[PDB]
Ligand binder design. Structure first.
Ligand SMILES: *[C@@H]1O[C@H](CO)[C@@H](O)[C@H](O)[C@H]1NC(C)=O
Lengths: 48, 74
């Protein structure tokens, strides 16, 4: 019915009607970082 | 390093990199290193060239090639 990875987590699922398998990729995450200069000179920042 | 690119690494460096043979977990993430390995290879090549050319005048002004046999004799 479905597959799993080396970490024993769901990795692919087949559709019962159209018997073809579908991949699963978790929704993107990650931390944010704020690049700033000294407040002595400006208040303009860039983010990554 | 060989100018016939891609040859930024020497033969031995390529052999080592091949010998070494060089997410989903929700919370776990791997950040990239600040210095790419191209920069590390460039640093190593610069050090090697400096120590092979300048001899005992590596770091100062110099800017001339000391003969290798002289360094070997020293
Ligand atoms: C920057 O500002 C802070 C306070 O806003 C002050 O303590 C510091 O001395 C200043 N430094 C410079 C280089 O202007």
């Amino acid at each position: 019915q479905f597959g799993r990875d080396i970490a024993d987590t769901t990795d692919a699922v087949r559709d019962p009607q159209t018997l073809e398998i579908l991949d699963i990729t978790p929704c993107s995450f990650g931390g944010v970082s704020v690049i700033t200069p000294g407040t002595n000179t400006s208040n303009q920042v860039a983010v990554l | 390093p060989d100018p016939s690119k891609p040859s930024k690494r020497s033969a031995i460096e390529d052999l080592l990199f091949n010998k070494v043979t060089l997410q989903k977990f929700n919370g776990l993430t791997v950040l990239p290193p600040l210095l790419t390995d191209e920069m590390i290879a460039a640093y190593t090549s610069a050090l090697l060239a400096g120590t092979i050319t300048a001899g005992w005048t590596f770091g100062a002004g110099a800017a001339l090639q000391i003969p290798f046999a002289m360094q070997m004799a020293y």
